[PDB]
Design a protein around this ligand. Structure first.
Ligand code: HEM
Ligand code: HEM
Ligand code: HEM
Ligand code: HEM
Lengths: 141, 146, 146, 141
């Protein structure tokens, strides 16, 4: 799914994200919860209020998870194995929700890095998110 | 297919500021680049091999403007989306055979382009309202299908 | 929404031969096994760990009979689907928050189950007619979406 | 994506299919053109008539291609690269179409092997078709 050009684009794109991966992850979640309320069903035990600290902490987790994946593009299945088990077997997240979060992540990146979010970057990042999403929804014990 | 009274106000107020040419051309261009199979419907426009050729293509820019103008009709007729897109629904579904999922994909690309153009002003609350508009437009275009 | 004159006839003719007990249950059973994320809405049904427990589950078989009953009311009220499923729409959409895409998956699994029971009598022409019915039902259930 | 258990199910199930792969592929196509007319778009030069020899000849191709894939479950990206270049780079087939053919293929199998098309085999066969589809719709070079 990911070509060499895509891997290059991703690594370079994440380099611009820098240390803001957690902030972006948090904002993306806020955008997802408001834009698609259905996703809130998965976080009953959360305080989804405006500026919630729980969402902020979780955003950080999601952001680090993504930085982790960018470092292991040639073996996402193994580097994200524990995460797949959690989302696919334990949580049983509808794969549709992953498209929602990915779209909200791209939207957030477009807002903060308008000059760097080019068509090519957008395209590779999208394939990247799709790849990560497939790994987290597949039950390949 | 509707929003709060305060949502419409926010949606329309932002539209006053949308340049259909710049936003339309970028949205169609990013659609063709991010979801390559959609290029199949515009071969008559020319070379769409790489993003450079696509974003600089005049046909793409001109057509993008037309598309954005249609969303504008939508935004100004949220209560009558089905009627506003009946003719286009016939064209895209019965004549072009475009799969409905692609109506939804262009809708999101558009929202991503709006986020890039308005930055921090395109708040998550504003986006949420636009996710409804885009959803409504896509559903109305898929009507003549089913 | 619409089927040809002898399309409805061939469709109903096949439905008259459908076992109300078996079919619905196997269809829900296969949905839970092939697309495991759907199991999330049926935890109260008990053990859905392996295909053996699912197909043999009493709750699954019973509930499937209900579901199969609904498609029936769908196959018989083609010209007025959005009205026959208006209630169930509010339930699945507004109450359960089931994503529309799943309505499509179950429709298709039902078709594969129908193909398994009827064999060569479930001709490609007949399946084509049922794909329209399946599409219609999925759309009606999604209609009331908010 | 494709676990060890799925692989065994796939190899075992395809053996029951045997030399009928071509026939099934042809029937699957016919079911697709009728059930989802939108797919006839990619075959303007085809005699999509009932019992067409062109459709039969093509079904054979699809059939052998899948038999080849079952033999390279551990390296689909490499084994199917020429078909990925064809469908993704040249034909630019909308990925939604692959889900339709996959569905029509499973329907065909349920018709001819109702006793072997058990829920477990149905699940593995579905993951197998999705993987193949991802590889043919991706531009990875
Ligand atoms: C590809 C994007 C995603 C990534 C990388 C991701 C990452 C993570 C991580 C790293 C954790 C656990 C962190 C920890 O152990 O504290 C987690 C937990 C979880 N994820 Fe995701 N996730 C993604 C998408 C989703 C989606 C779309 C949903 C559903 C809307 C979801 C629902 C959850 C839930 C409910 C938890 C458990 C939260 C808790 O109880 O603390 N995730 N995710
Ligand atoms: C919400 C989405 C969409 C909207 C609102 C939209 C709007 C329009 C409009 C306004 C026209 C102009 C027709 C005329 O000049 O009379 C048109 C034409 C067309 N659309 Fe779309 N469109 C949408 C999605 C798509 C998609 C996703 C595809 C295909 C992947 C597509 C392919 C075409 C083609 C090929 C034409 C003919 C272009 C020409 O020769 O002028 N459209 N569309
Ligand atoms: C075309 C598709 C479907 C049809 C025709 C359908 C039909 C029905 C019907 C008739 C009921 C009975 C309600 C009552 O007794 O008043 C029901 C309940 C329900 N449905 Fe569906 N349904 C469909 C798809 C789904 C899907 C895909 C899911 C989940 C992934 C789902 C989850 C449920 C649940 C959880 C209930 C409540 C069960 C209970 O507590 O008894 N349904 N459905
Ligand atoms: C997973 C299923 C698929 C496989 C394994 C597959 C396999 C093949 C093979 C082997 C060929 C090349 C045969 C040759 O060299 O003559 C081919 C050609 C082709 N395929 Fe597919 N295909 C699949 C899905 C699709 C889909 C979904 C479409 C679109 C509806 C499609 C459209 C075509 C077209 C148009 C050609 C060229 C036909 C011609 O001009 O003769 N394929 N495919």
């Amino acid at each position: 799914v990911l070509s060499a050009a895509d891997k290059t684009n991703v690594k370079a794109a994440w380099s611009k994200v820098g240390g803001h991966a957690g902030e972006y992850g948090a904002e993306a979640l806020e955008r997802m919860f408001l834009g698609f309320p259905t996703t809130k069903t998965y976080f009953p035990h959360f305080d989804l209020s405006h500026g919630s600290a729980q969402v902020k902490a979780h955003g950080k987790k999601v952001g680090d998870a993504l930085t982790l994946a960018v470092g292991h593009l040639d073996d996402l299945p193994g580097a994200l194995s524990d995460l797949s088990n959690l989302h696919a077997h334990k949580l049983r997240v509808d794969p549709v929700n992953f498209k929602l979060l990915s779209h909200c992540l791209l939207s957030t990146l477009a807002v903060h890095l308008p000059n760097d979010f080019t068509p090519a970057v957008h395209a590779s990042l999208d394939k990247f998110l799709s790849s990560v999403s497939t790994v987290l929804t597949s039950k390949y014990r | 297919v509707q929003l709060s009274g305060e949502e419409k106000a926010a949606v329309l107020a932002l539209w006053d500021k949308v340049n259909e040419e710049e936003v339309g051309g970028e949205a169609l261009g990013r659609l063709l680049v991010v979801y390559p199979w959609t290029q199949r419907f515009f071969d008559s426009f020319g070379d769409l091999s790489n993003p450079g050729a696509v974003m600089g293509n005049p046909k793409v820019k001109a057509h993008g403007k037309k598309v954005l103008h249609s969303f504008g009709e939508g935004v100004h007729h949220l209560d009558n989306l089905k009627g506003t897109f009946a003719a286009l629904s016939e064209l895209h579904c019965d004549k072009l055979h475009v799969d409905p999922e692609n109506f939804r994909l262009l809708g999101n690309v558009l929202v991503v382009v709006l986020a890039r153009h308005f930055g921090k002003d395109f708040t998550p609350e504003l986006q949420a309202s636009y996710q409804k508009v885009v959803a409504g437009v896509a559903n109305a275009l898929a009507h003549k299908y089913h």
